[PDB]
Structure 1
């Protein structure tokens, strides 16, 4: 509890129509996207973390959304430990909570900026260093302001999800319509799929000769992967419509007949991201320990790196499948990888639906509070009925998401199942929210 006077965006007093919200979302996205391509002035790793944090080095957006996401996760953890003991009956407490979030996020921004400028590869040699610190400071401050703006109500929804979906879609299009070329002995071969296909159709003009080469392209992206990714995109859109609806009726106010839907992707985003973070952390720590220590019994047993990839170790088994060749080579590794990822995703969905407060007991309590009851069932059996549907549905959704991720990683699409699945889930949430609200 303290006092503070800091800049912040004000919420609209009335509900904003759909068109202004769409335009503001578009403009904010354009500004955030431009901000990440301009190089710094005084200038003279793992792709996984930079892709999931939606940031790239050598530009004004070096830190990305890392401070916002880490502040949000830290405050989520603090709320989970029941240490802040926040009471929903007080709004000043929530305002203080949010102002504490902001004041710790800005401190983390400053600390991370000082760290990266002091130890980064820019160099030890002072006004240039001050300017280089101020640039990153002001850039990340503007990004925080934009996030808070989109979150106050001027935007369709959250901002971090939108930025991540934007980077994913941009990478997916760049792996298809790339204008760059690489001249390796034979000549110029485009780095895009459709571009290279049309180019080989035009300059070579030999149908059966050029098509067979443009279709496989063992070294560079081709049309087969684009077709596979559009097919799996259609399939993922199809799998969202699966939902169980149970009939409910009210007892407090009669004449109220309704339906409560239960989707298959109950908590879709959580298990995939948690599993990806687990795998990335395991791989990173294994690489670090095998780089520091030359050879040890436990170090060799947990993982050995070679050509770089892990092999002959526990970290070797967790490595994803590359294609059908390695799949048919070692069947035991493929089988153990499949069962491991499926069990992990299932247990993750279970523990997350248990900890998120969406258990059948919690929703039954919410029903009893609201007074809704099943049309053709009694009152003292609602929890017993929800026990027969909710956990099974959650586990099945987790399992099918994991299977789809394995299939995407194996069939060789342009992007992993995780990224495409995240983008599709976010856009589907946006669309269903806009539909249930009602608007063009």
Structure 2
């Protein structure tokens, strides 16, 4: 604890209406998108159109995210001993957030300017440091503004959803062309469809030539991603509403919804990280040892993609050809990706403090009970509801990811689901609170 005079946005004294909120969200989004397209000054195809490297958004939201996860882990491991009974330790924690983020920004900026390919030879170095510092400070202040109450929600999730939708739309309506021997071809699906339908004048052949397009995006992937988007939107309304009633103040009746997608999409990320790590480890080990009685069994790599090994079994299927090739690998991969997701979802609800015991404790604290049941049975009733919901939600998310990667959509099921969840949160909040 100490005294700090740092720039911070003050919360509104009254609730902000929906129109001002939406317009501020839009303005902040436009500023964040324009900030990441401008290159630096002193630095010496495009080579910077794909990733945000060489622009004012070099660091981006990485320092904020790293500080957030570090202090979240520090809170989870029970080393801060925070108590919600006071309104000062919370502010101290919020200022610790910022004083750690600032020093991390400084360190990372110095590392990049001293090591990156911008150039070793003083005023230019000072300018390159100041640009990155000012941009990171602007992004942090903008996130704080959107989170304090002037925006529909957080900033990080909004920026991620915006990037996902931007990539989805650039994979389809890209004006860039590519000429490799045969001629000039658009890098988009709809653009090339209309081009080949207009100029080629051979409809029966141009339609088939523009619908499959083994080398580039086509219309089939667009139809598949639209269908998957609609299906994901349908599976967002599933919810289990159990009736509850109050006992402190009589006359308060409501419902407690238990969604299908219970977890926060963290276990799928953990499972993908785990399988990627074990695959790369098997690759490196097979590279180190050519032939061994056990290493030949654990993994074999050849023409890179592993074959006749455990890493070959756990590798993801790219298209339907590999699926119809050998059903054994397909069924093993399906069972693995579903079981691991279910187990990770159960463990995550057991760890993250959303277990049925915590919900029963919250019920006892607020005084609520279940409508047609006793008071000593809320725990025994939530035990028969919450774990099943979490496991089935994890299994459904895994199956959706597998189907999306199999049918070859423009975006993986995980990103589509994250964006859909982020937007459905805003929609549900606006419907519950009441606004245009």
Q: TM-score range by the shorter chain?
A: over 0.9
How big is each residue's C-alpha offset from its partner over 1:340-381, in whole Å with a ceiling of 9 and x where there is no partner?
Answer: 221221112111111221111111111112222222111211
Give structure 1 stretches of 5+ with no counterpart: none
Distance 1:55 1:374, change over 3 A: farther
Report the equivalent of 2:138: 142
Superposition RMSD in Å: 3.0
Contact kept, 8 Å, 1:240 with 1:265, in 2: the verdict is: yes
1:97-151 Cα shifts (integer Å, max 9, x gaps): 0111100011111111122222223333332222212211111111111111111
Q: Offset of 1:187 from its aligned partner?
A: 1.2
Structure 1 stretch 410-419 or stretch 329-338: which is displaced more? Answer: 329-338
2:3 equivalent in structure 1: 3
- Aligned partners of 2:49 and 2:344: how far apart in 1? 22
1:330 positional shift: 3.9
Pair 1:141–1:284, CA change in 2 (3 A): farther
1: CA distance between counterparts of 2:298 and 2:162?
A: 37
Q: 1:232 to 1:366 in 2, by over 3 A?
A: same
Structure 1 residues 117 and 16: alpha-carbon distance in aligned structure 2, compared to 1, 3 A threshold: same
* 3-state secondary structure, aligned to 1:236: helix
Does the aligned pair in 2 maintain the 1:345–1:399 contact within 8 Å? yes
Quote the offset at 1:269 in angstroms: 2.1
Task: Tell me if the contact between 2:48 and 2:54 (Cα under 8 Å) persists in the aligned partners.
Answer: no
Change (3 A) 1:121 1:429: same
Distance 1:285 1:59 in 2: 34
Structure 1-normalised TM-score? Answer: 0.92
Structure 2 stretches lacking a partner, 5+ long: none
Rounded to whole Å, the distance in 1 between the matches of 2:234 and 2:433 is: 22
Relative distance call for 1:141 and 1:396 in structure 2 (3 A) is: same
Please give the per-residue CA displacement for 1:29-63, whole angstroms capped at 9, x wherever unaligned.
0110111111111222xxxx999999621211111
Q: Aligned pairs, how many?
A: 436
Structure 1 residues 164 and 286: CA distance shift in structure 2, 3 A: farther
Change (3 A) 1:263 1:58: same
Q: 1:287 to 1:69 in 2, by over 3 A?
A: farther
1:416 deviation in Å?
0.7
Distance 1:178 1:124, change over 3 A: same
- Residue 268 of structure 1 contacts residue 397 of structure 1 at CA under 8 Å; is this kept in 2? no
Determine the structure 2 residue equivalent to 1:91.
87
Q: 2:190 aligns with which of 183, 194, 205?
A: 194
C-alpha distance in structure 2 between counterparts of 1:131 and 1:37, whole Å = 18
